[PDB]
Amino acid sequence: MLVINGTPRKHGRTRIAASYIAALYHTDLIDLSEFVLPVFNGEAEQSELLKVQELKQRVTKADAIVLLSPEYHSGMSGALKNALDFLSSEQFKYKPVALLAVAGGGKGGINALNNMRTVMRGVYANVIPKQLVLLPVHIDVENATVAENIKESIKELVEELSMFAKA
Amino acid sequence: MLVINGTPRKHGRTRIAASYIAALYHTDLIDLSEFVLPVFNGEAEQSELLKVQELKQRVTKADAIVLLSPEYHSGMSGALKNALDFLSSEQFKYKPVALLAVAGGGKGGINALNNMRTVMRGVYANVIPKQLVLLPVHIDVENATVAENIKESIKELVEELSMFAKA
């Protein structure tokens, strides 16, 4: 299983949630706050950058992917969308994918979730029904972890994902 | 009026569409294929960057914005979304905005437009009802211009935008 943190901010909540999942379920982790890619430009030179080549290899190799992203302006991060722009159905086709969005509060998160789902379908990925929105109340920044109130939801998310990866 | 080209590819169709509009209507132009920003990372140092400050001022002073983007995996480009992530409602609130998507295939464009409208709403922009989709048939790459069949469509889009800007 592969977990991708979609927040470019080293101090972002989404990064906390991503780390929690990867550690707990012994999964692979791509952290976009550390995995700095250039802005896609369609030039062939970019397809020979180690990081881009690595992104393709690890996504193709994952039997299942948990896609995390903060909600920036009612959409997924440009950081994550930029990363996906390097990729195609070549890596995502029939790929079991689970969606999680981290919002600033209220009714945020849905737009980002749908954005990710739409884009995942654009590359012919299999996005499981269960999707999750995390709010600031679900994140513990000082202790660098998620709150107890959301741990059950995340487990349900991962379990549905890995179960669908087998099926 | 400000025209923003959302395609990072110097050889992109969207860039040709954006240049046609900017030249014809004597508008300000931001071209993401030449206007390369860093991947947003939420760090204060980035706000000092000249291009970031320029991006904010130019969008702020614009009486109206023509937002173009290619459909990348059923969404706006990562380059465009990344640029928008540097911005907020402070620059976009009540800003008259027209949406134009450039798809590569028959029934493409709708998903990008949804994504764009949703995002523009997220920053409280005033998106006009009329939106437009350009196909490869509407772009003459060889002559670096748009086909005659679409010139009237583009014209009417700009005109509705000006009208909103005046209101």
Ligand SMILES: Cc1cc2nc3c(=O)[nH]c(=O)nc-3n(C[C@H](O)[C@H](O)[C@H](O)COP(=O)(O)O)c2cc1C
């Ligand atoms: C550029 C930017 C745009 C944001 N837009 C939204 C938004 O549209 N809706 C929302 O609920 N929160 C928004 N937020 C707040 C984020 O949800 C908040 O930072 C949250 O912790 C997830 O982002 P993070 O992983 O970077 O921490 C935005 C934050 C930034 C930096």
Ligand SMILES: Cc1cc2nc3c(=O)[nH]c(=O)nc-3n(C[C@H](O)[C@H](O)[C@H](O)COP(=O)(O)O)c2cc1C
């Ligand atoms: C990364 C990437 C993803 C694309 N995905 C789509 C797609 O989702 N739907 C579509 O109609 N065209 C898609 N295309 C084709 C573009 O629409 C085509 O390149 C078009 O000319 C607009 O992009 P451009 O401005 O870079 O030329 C994609 C192109 C790229 C580079």
